[PDB]
């Protein structure tokens, strides 16, 4: 849409830690506040600071708080692929 | 929480609902007008949050942007929505 | 797990009603949605909107739904102290 673009990403959780920080506005979806240099998420370049997380492995996380979302990410099994749907806010608009 | 899907036929210019939010985003239904199109679709309720319109995600849109999209939908056509019910809160 | 500033509070249940509204995430760690002006909870200023209730009189309620929690609070005897452990969440979460 004019407000944001939906992306899908596959990520392999090779390590205990994925290397990101999650926050929210109190209301919508949680979103990515930081990506740690040299971590797993940093290697997947379609994921960006500002991206809102819409789902994890097909589970809708609408209205989960950031800590619940991070808890879920921590609980994912090591050495397994997982998927996410993200919305990337548009920073610019054409006319 | 409880997610619902609904189909609605936009027969009139006006659907007969009022959309609000709490200043930041994630719009919900404030009013449903008696005898309008939305009133006849009883699975839609005051308080329901609108997650999407025709598959387009709108969580984090402000109420005016949401109402704009609804106004822009073509007359005499079915559209769909996914709605999220408001979370239940008991007092103590 | 859950992470953040943990607080302990004593509250005297002087009235039938404590003056708070409770809600939750779909399974548990219910939290405080509203505090009623001029009620018992309002007078105890270490308690805030957004605080998650970890326990009541030492009984763990991680994973009770909001109605079960409110029932418990309603059932506490009038004119008696009770205690609670609460947790004030952080602004961000690492994964």
From Swiss-Prot, chain B:
Residues 5-85 form the PDZ domain. It is found in: Cytoplasm. Expressed at highest levels in ascending colon and at moderate levels in adult kidney. Expressed at low levels in adult pancreas and at very low levels in adult liver. Expression is down-regulated in several primary tumors, such as kidney, colon and rectal tumors. Probably interacts with SEMA5A. Belongs to the GIPC family. This is PDZ domain-containing protein GIPC2. The chain holds residues 113 to 200 of 315 of the full protein.
